[PDB]
Design an enzyme around this catalytic site. Structure first.
Site, PDB file in Angstrom:
ATOM      1  CG  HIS A 181      -2.452  -0.731   0.265  1.00 54.67           C
ATOM      2  ND1 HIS A 181      -3.537  -1.143   0.844  1.00 54.67           N
ATOM      3  CD2 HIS A 181      -2.286  -1.244  -0.906  1.00 54.67           C
ATOM      4  CE1 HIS A 181      -4.254  -1.779   0.049  1.00 54.67           C
ATOM      5  NE2 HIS A 181      -3.808  -1.971  -0.986  1.00 54.67           N
ATOM      6  CB  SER A 232      -1.206  -1.870  -8.753  1.00 52.46           C
ATOM      7  OG  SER A 232      -1.651  -2.820  -7.917  1.00 52.46           O
ATOM      8  CE  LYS A 283     -10.941  -5.201 -15.411  1.00 50.41           C
ATOM      9  NZ  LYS A 283     -10.957  -3.887 -16.098  1.00 50.41           N
ATOM     10  CG  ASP A 284     -11.664  -6.584  -7.081  1.00 48.51           C
ATOM     11  OD1 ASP A 284     -10.819  -6.537  -8.217  1.00 48.51           O
ATOM     12  OD2 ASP A 284     -11.022  -6.221  -6.046  1.00 48.51           O
ATOM     13  CD  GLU A 317      -4.349 -32.784  -3.308  1.00 44.45           C
ATOM     14  OE1 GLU A 317      -5.529 -32.919  -3.775  1.00 44.45           O
ATOM     15  OE2 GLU A 317      -4.251 -32.394  -2.012  1.00 44.45           O
TER      16      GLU A 317
HETATM   17  C1  HEM Z   1      -2.375 -15.917   0.680  1.00 48.31           C
HETATM   18  C2  HEM Z   1      -1.918 -15.738  -0.563  1.00 48.31           C
HETATM   19  C3  HEM Z   1      -1.980 -14.262  -1.248  1.00 48.31           C
HETATM   20  C4  HEM Z   1      -2.740 -13.371  -1.109  1.00 48.31           C
HETATM   21  C5  HEM Z   1      -4.030 -13.338  -0.184  1.00 48.31           C
HETATM   22  C6  HEM Z   1      -2.459 -12.011  -1.811  1.00 48.31           C
HETATM   23  C7  HEM Z   1      -3.211 -10.962  -2.188  1.00 48.31           C
HETATM   24  C8  HEM Z   1      -2.846  -9.785  -2.859  1.00 48.31           C
HETATM   25  C9  HEM Z   1      -3.557  -8.842  -3.146  1.00 48.31           C
HETATM   26  C10 HEM Z   1      -5.079  -8.538  -2.626  1.00 48.31           C
HETATM   27  C11 HEM Z   1      -2.803  -8.245  -3.958  1.00 48.31           C
HETATM   28  C12 HEM Z   1      -3.530  -6.725  -4.719  1.00 48.31           C
HETATM   29  C13 HEM Z   1      -4.043  -6.934  -6.202  1.00 48.31           C
HETATM   30  C14 HEM Z   1      -2.841  -7.656  -6.966  1.00 48.31           C
HETATM   31  O1  HEM Z   1      -1.929  -6.878  -7.066  1.00 48.31           O
HETATM   32  O2  HEM Z   1      -3.226  -8.449  -7.486  1.00 48.31           O
HETATM   33  C15 HEM Z   1      -1.627  -8.511  -4.052  1.00 48.31           C
HETATM   34  C16 HEM Z   1      -0.570  -8.059  -4.972  1.00 48.31           C
HETATM   35  C17 HEM Z   1       0.710  -8.801  -5.043  1.00 48.31           C
HETATM   36  N1  HEM Z   1       1.110  -9.813  -4.748  1.00 48.31           N
HETATM   37 FE1  HEM Z   1      -0.001 -11.125  -3.448  1.00 48.31          FE
HETATM   38  N2  HEM Z   1      -1.294 -12.427  -2.487  1.00 48.31           N
HETATM   39  C18 HEM Z   1      -0.847 -13.808  -2.254  1.00 48.31           C
HETATM   40  C19 HEM Z   1       0.194 -14.665  -2.675  1.00 48.31           C
HETATM   41  C20 HEM Z   1       1.186 -13.758  -3.167  1.00 48.31           C
HETATM   42  C21 HEM Z   1       2.275 -14.628  -3.535  1.00 48.31           C
HETATM   43  C22 HEM Z   1       2.635 -16.100  -3.591  1.00 48.31           C
HETATM   44  C23 HEM Z   1       3.188 -13.806  -4.272  1.00 48.31           C
HETATM   45  C24 HEM Z   1       4.783 -14.009  -4.846  1.00 48.31           C
HETATM   46  C25 HEM Z   1       5.164 -15.022  -4.276  1.00 48.31           C
HETATM   47  C26 HEM Z   1       2.795 -12.337  -3.989  1.00 48.31           C
HETATM   48  C27 HEM Z   1       3.083 -11.169  -4.781  1.00 48.31           C
HETATM   49  C28 HEM Z   1       2.409 -10.039  -4.811  1.00 48.31           C
HETATM   50  C29 HEM Z   1       2.893  -8.844  -5.527  1.00 48.31           C
HETATM   51  C30 HEM Z   1       4.226  -8.882  -6.098  1.00 48.31           C
HETATM   52  C31 HEM Z   1       1.875  -8.293  -5.663  1.00 48.31           C
HETATM   53  C32 HEM Z   1       1.963  -6.621  -6.327  1.00 48.31           C
HETATM   54  C33 HEM Z   1       2.137  -6.604  -7.862  1.00 48.31           C
HETATM   55  C34 HEM Z   1       1.696  -5.322  -8.233  1.00 48.31           C
HETATM   56  O3  HEM Z   1       0.459  -5.153  -8.235  1.00 48.31           O
HETATM   57  O4  HEM Z   1       2.461  -4.509  -8.678  1.00 48.31           O
HETATM   58  N3  HEM Z   1       1.384 -12.463  -3.451  1.00 48.31           N
HETATM   59  N4  HEM Z   1      -1.503  -9.698  -3.541  1.00 48.31           N
HETATM   60  C1  HEM Z   2      -6.508 -21.727   4.183  1.00 47.98           C
HETATM   61  C2  HEM Z   2      -5.955 -22.470   3.630  1.00 47.98           C
HETATM   62  C3  HEM Z   2      -6.291 -24.026   3.550  1.00 47.98           C
HETATM   63  C4  HEM Z   2      -6.209 -25.054   2.461  1.00 47.98           C
HETATM   64  C5  HEM Z   2      -5.403 -25.043   1.113  1.00 47.98           C
HETATM   65  C6  HEM Z   2      -7.395 -26.118   2.711  1.00 47.98           C
HETATM   66  C7  HEM Z   2      -7.242 -27.247   1.920  1.00 47.98           C
HETATM   67  C8  HEM Z   2      -7.621 -28.514   2.259  1.00 47.98           C
HETATM   68  C9  HEM Z   2      -7.581 -29.737   1.632  1.00 47.98           C
HETATM   69  C10 HEM Z   2      -6.869 -29.654   0.209  1.00 47.98           C
HETATM   70  C11 HEM Z   2      -8.275 -30.441   2.187  1.00 47.98           C
HETATM   71  C12 HEM Z   2      -8.288 -32.344   2.078  1.00 47.98           C
HETATM   72  C13 HEM Z   2     -10.024 -32.425   1.742  1.00 47.98           C
HETATM   73  C14 HEM Z   2     -10.058 -33.646   0.827  1.00 47.98           C
HETATM   74  O1  HEM Z   2      -9.446 -33.516  -0.287  1.00 47.98           O
HETATM   75  O2  HEM Z   2     -10.770 -34.826   1.098  1.00 47.98           O
HETATM   76  C15 HEM Z   2      -8.789 -29.985   3.456  1.00 47.98           C
HETATM   77  C16 HEM Z   2      -9.483 -30.679   4.398  1.00 47.98           C
HETATM   78  C17 HEM Z   2      -9.884 -30.309   5.770  1.00 47.98           C
HETATM   79  N1  HEM Z   2      -9.717 -28.798   6.143  1.00 47.98           N
HETATM   80 FE1  HEM Z   2      -8.844 -27.297   4.824  1.00 47.98          FE
HETATM   81  N2  HEM Z   2      -7.775 -26.070   3.910  1.00 47.98           N
HETATM   82  C18 HEM Z   2      -7.574 -24.646   4.394  1.00 47.98           C
HETATM   83  C19 HEM Z   2      -8.160 -23.949   5.393  1.00 47.98           C
HETATM   84  C20 HEM Z   2      -8.726 -24.678   6.443  1.00 47.98           C
HETATM   85  C21 HEM Z   2      -9.297 -24.057   7.296  1.00 47.98           C
HETATM   86  C22 HEM Z   2      -9.282 -22.502   7.669  1.00 47.98           C
HETATM   87  C23 HEM Z   2      -9.998 -24.955   8.353  1.00 47.98           C
HETATM   88  C24 HEM Z   2     -10.681 -24.830   9.603  1.00 47.98           C
HETATM   89  C25 HEM Z   2     -10.481 -24.005  10.419  1.00 47.98           C
HETATM   90  C26 HEM Z   2      -9.874 -26.214   7.757  1.00 47.98           C
HETATM   91  C27 HEM Z   2     -10.490 -27.341   8.035  1.00 47.98           C
HETATM   92  C28 HEM Z   2     -10.293 -28.418   7.241  1.00 47.98           C
HETATM   93  C29 HEM Z   2     -10.771 -29.914   7.652  1.00 47.98           C
HETATM   94  C30 HEM Z   2     -11.571 -30.014   8.915  1.00 47.98           C
HETATM   95  C31 HEM Z   2     -10.706 -30.598   6.682  1.00 47.98           C
HETATM   96  C32 HEM Z   2     -11.114 -32.351   6.851  1.00 47.98           C
HETATM   97  C33 HEM Z   2     -12.374 -32.842   6.097  1.00 47.98           C
HETATM   98  C34 HEM Z   2     -11.971 -32.996   4.675  1.00 47.98           C
HETATM   99  O3  HEM Z   2     -11.228 -33.753   4.041  1.00 47.98           O
HETATM  100  O4  HEM Z   2     -12.712 -32.020   4.057  1.00 47.98           O
HETATM  101  N3  HEM Z   2      -8.980 -26.080   6.319  1.00 47.98           N
HETATM  102  N4  HEM Z   2      -8.398 -28.964   3.403  1.00 47.98           N
END
Ligand code: HEM
Ligand code: HEM
Lengths: 22, 33, 106, 62, 112, 379, 48
Positions: free
Chosen positions: F201, F205, F227-228, F271
């Site tokens: 911020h 961007s 857009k979002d 996966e």
């Molecule tokens: C939980 C995962 C993530 C969330 C929730 C998230 C969220 C955001 C949001 C809301 C924006 C502003 C809109 C946009 O720029 O598209 C942003 C920008 C950006 N994100 Fe993330 N992002 C995530 C993962 C990542 C990862 C894995 C990377 C790189 C490894 C990354 C790098 C960036 C960069 C470089 C920008 C700004 C680019 C620009 O707008 O000039 N983010 N992210």
């Molecule tokens: C935020 C990142 C998260 C990712 C990437 C994620 C992804 C996954 C995946 C890939 C599975 C396997 C289910 C299947 O293929 O059978 C799973 C299961 C599960 N996740 Fe998440 N999850 C997320 C967040 C959470 C959160 C915040 C909660 C609860 C607070 C949660 C609770 C569970 C539980 C209880 C299961 C087991 C039952 C099932 O297999 O559906 N996960 N999650």
């Protein structure tokens, strides 16, 4: 002023919303 | 600032009773002669 | 001993130039650099014409990138006109820096 | 002259957002029901006699 | 009637903006108006009474903060503007009606 | 100020980050992934909590509990599937976000990028544990294989692997731990996401062109909120298309077979989201060399910044860069293909060359291409 | 194996129709607003 009318439509909306929604 | 380039100039000061009279009103405000 | 080879780079250069589409966008090389610390100062030393002009062209080009439309074929930057107007300004900026770095060894 | 359907709709319901919401609340209701009724029917037509709805007859009350 | 062809033919009403940036100038001038009626109309005196309320204000108004037009009061109090003025530009076929304000570059939005 | 809602409460001013924020005008549709990225994370959480609201973290029940979720619990079936397919979307989105960092050089935002990598690795941990949760044959053997991979470390490894598992195999202890870690991870993630936002911020961007757009900014609210929203509609459409009409399609693993601790995953594999790494991993003979080069596949990202060679932070005006950029994407595709491949000759020799390609493209090819392009432009 | 097979596909029907009304509507909304910018025209007039 315009609040009664507007509060009346706002009250309507909440009502019908609950009723239906719920 | 307003550009004073042309013939238009016509500002110079001299009235009857009042001379260089500046007013400050609650609403309006100014500078006369 | 460059007569054949370095009179022919102009051909890849020319090919490359229009290949990078900024060409089309109304932009000029100078206006495409990465804006970092040296570049900034440089930009800050541009005379009003030069500098208002970059602002208009990026204002035109970003306008276009927003709309995904290319400018007319008539209205496109021609390689032969490479105003490296930032280069002058940019160089010193760098030049002054390097000195400042160098003076800082011992 | 008369107001286009839109303009009529506009001056009756959208000028005041209070009316505009109300509208939306009521249309959200009416619309659900037709959508479901239509949409359901559509679906059930595509699988004629495939679904219990169609088949409860065989073993029902003799 | 062959004269009857209005020389005074309506002018088409358009809600556009024209922004002309010049950061080289000290203050900012904004004119905002919505279209109004011609010269002759019941609504047209009533408008005036409504602009009466908003008012018109200057760096030099004696009452600043105690002005009664809350617009006035707020630019008085919060140094929000240099001078503003509501207007009703009466024409035959159309009008121009709204405010106009002069202010700093950092004040445009609150004024608006 | 008086009665300007937004500035009045201090808390409410902090939210004007989504309204009155200067937003570049020009701006590909690859900028919605950020916002989608965050809907994803809320979607999972929600859904998740609900699943967690009827799931049991034991060897005996886990599979049963899952199975109960999608049979006798009301709407427990979509929620679960929605949750599973959710995590495919969260990764799909994830890779789009990064592709863009790579391409337009958003990673010029040194500090913002770093947190991005952190984020990216933090979702990977979570997706790796949750899959384990149901306790299916696939989950049971992949958790073993991957954590045992860690035992490649010479002095510690071995002891370590055992502490992680909380025993000598992956019985209860192990399973109960993943549940808890899965649970809290995403909450920890959300703080990070928000710190990520925080740093961006400060600079705004970047854009297709790759030039400052302060001369061209636009209020976030009017535009970008629409857009979002639209992007979210498209996002939700892909998630439900997949959930409602192709439930497991994407979920490669068919293994709905409770895990019997002595059996044969013909071809065990993470996966889709992890196949690249996997492939990468197999290509090395030695198991420690594979782990390091498994770690480097993903961590490489933290050096991109320091590999940037050009003067145009925007690949957009640079054709040779574009070509290798795409290659690596298709290389990356190729690597995911290897992931589901049997261990054999054909796939080995292919995967080997694809790993080399992958580090070549990031480590050596691109950087050279950077200089070349800069020389061509006489820069 | 999948009890929910029928509900699911009916749902798919309702999610497809609905989405065939919201995607086109919300795109409209998006052009409504954006129109201002996409219709916009520029002009540069130095004193120079
Ligand atoms: C939980 C995962 C993530 C969330 C929730 C998230 C969220 C955001 C949001 C809301 C924006 C502003 C809109 C946009 O720029 O598209 C942003 C920008 C950006 N994100 Fe993330 N992002 C995530 C993962 C990542 C990862 C894995 C990377 C790189 C490894 C990354 C790098 C960036 C960069 C470089 C920008 C700004 C680019 C620009 O707008 O000039 N983010 N992210
Ligand atoms: C935020 C990142 C998260 C990712 C990437 C994620 C992804 C996954 C995946 C890939 C599975 C396997 C289910 C299947 O293929 O059978 C799973 C299961 C599960 N996740 Fe998440 N999850 C997320 C967040 C959470 C959160 C915040 C909660 C609860 C607070 C949660 C609770 C569970 C539980 C209880 C299961 C087991 C039952 C099932 O297999 O559906 N996960 N999650």
């Amino acid at each position: 002023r315009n609040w009664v009318p507007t509060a009346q439509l706002w009250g309507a909306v909440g009502a019908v919303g609950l009723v239906s929604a719920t | 600032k307003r550009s004073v380039l042309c013939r238009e100039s016509l500002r110079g000061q001299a009235a009857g009773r009042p001379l260089v009279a500046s007013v400050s009103l609650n609403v309006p405000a100014s500078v006369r002669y | 001993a460059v007569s054949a080879s370095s009179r022919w780079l102009e051909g890849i250069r020319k090919w490359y130039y229009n290949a990078a589409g900024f060409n089309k966008l109304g932009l000029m090389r100078d206006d495409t650099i990465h804006e970092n610390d040296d570049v900034k100062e440089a930009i800050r030393r541009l005379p009003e014409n030069l500098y208002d002009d970059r602002v208009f062209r990026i204002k035109r080009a970003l306008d276009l990138s927003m709309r995904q439309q290319i400018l007319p074929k008539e209205q496109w930057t021609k390689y032969e006109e490479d105003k490296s107007y930032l280069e002058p300004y940019l160089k010193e900026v760098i030049r002054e820096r390097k000195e400042r770095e160098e003076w800082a060894k011992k | 002259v008369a107001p286009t359907l839109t303009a009529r709709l506009y001056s009756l319901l959208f000028r005041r957002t209070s009316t505009f919401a109300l509208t939306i609340v009521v249309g959200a209701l009416f619309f659900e029901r037709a959508f479901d009724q239509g949409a359901d029917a559509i679906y059930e037509h595509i699988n004629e006699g495939k679904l219990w709805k169609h088949i409860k007859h065989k073993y029902e009350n003799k | 009637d062959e004269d009857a062809v209005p020389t005074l033919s309506p002018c088409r009403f358009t809600g556009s903006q024209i922004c002309h940036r010049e950061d080289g100038l000290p203050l900012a001038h904004v004119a905002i108006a919505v279209e109004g009626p011609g010269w002759a109309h019941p609504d047209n005196v009533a408008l005036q009474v409504a602009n009466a309320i908003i008012g018109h204000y200057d760096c030099t108004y004696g009452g600043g903060a105690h002005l009664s037009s809350p617009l006035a009061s707020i630019a008085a109090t919060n140094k929000l503007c240099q001078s503003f003025q509501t207007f009703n530009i009466c024409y035959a076929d159309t009008g121009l009606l709204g405010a106009h304000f002069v202010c700093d570059h950092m004040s445009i939005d609150d004024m608006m | 100020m008086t009665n300007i809602r937004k500035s009045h409460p201090l808390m409410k001013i902090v939210n004007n980050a989504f309204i009155d924020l200067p937003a570049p005008s020009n701006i590909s549709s690859w900028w919605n992934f950020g916002s989608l990225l965050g809907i994803c994370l809320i979607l999972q959480i929600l859904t998740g909590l609900f699943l967690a609201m009827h799931y049991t973290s034991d060897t005996t029940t886990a599979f049963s509990s899952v199975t109960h979720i999608c049979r006798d619990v009301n709407y427990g079936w979509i929620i679960r599937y929605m949750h599973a397919n959710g995590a495919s979307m969260f990764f799909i989105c994830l890779y789009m976000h990064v592709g863009r960092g790579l391409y337009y050089g958003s990673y010029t935002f040194l500090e913002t990028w770093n947190i991005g990598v952190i984020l990216l690795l933090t979702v990977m941990a979570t997706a790796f544990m949750g899959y384990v949760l149901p306790w299916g044959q696939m989950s049971f053997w992949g958790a073993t294989v991957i954590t045992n991979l860690l035992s490649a470390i010479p002095y510690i490894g071995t002891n370590l692997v055992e502490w992680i598992w909380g025993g000598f195999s992956v019985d209860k202890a192990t399973l109960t731990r993943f549940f808890a870690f899965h649970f809290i991870l995403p909450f920890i993630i959300m703080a990070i996401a928000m710190v990520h936002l925080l740093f961006l911020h400060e600079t705004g961007s970047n854009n297709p062109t790759g030039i400052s757009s302060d001369v061209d900014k636009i209020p976030f609210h009017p535009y970008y909120t629409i857009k979002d929203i639209l992007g979210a509609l498209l996002l939700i459409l892909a998630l439900m298309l997949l959930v409602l009409f192709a439930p497991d399609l994407l979920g490669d693993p068919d293994n709905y077979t409770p895990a019997n601790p002595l059996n044969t995953p013909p071809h065990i594999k993470p996966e889709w989201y992890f196949l690249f790494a996997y492939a990468i991993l197999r290509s090395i003979p030695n198991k420690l060399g594979g782990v390091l080069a498994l770690a480097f596949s993903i961590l490489i990202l933290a050096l991109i910044p320091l590999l940037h060679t050009s003067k145009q932070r925007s690949m957009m005006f640079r054709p040779l860069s574009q070509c290798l950029f795409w290659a690596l994407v298709a290389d990356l595709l190729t690597l995911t293909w290897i992931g589901g491949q049997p261990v054999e000759h054909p796939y080995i020799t292919i995967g080997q060359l694809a790993s080399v390609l992958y580090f070549l493209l990031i480590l050596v090819l691109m950087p050279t291409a950077g200089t070349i392009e800069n020389k061509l432009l006489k820069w | 194996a999948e009890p929910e097979h029928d509900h699911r596909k009916r749902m798919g029907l309702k999610m497809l129709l609905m989405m065939g009304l919201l995607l086109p509507l919300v795109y409209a909304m998006k052009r409504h607003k954006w129109s201002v910018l996409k219709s916009r025209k520029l002009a540069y007039r130095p004193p120079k």
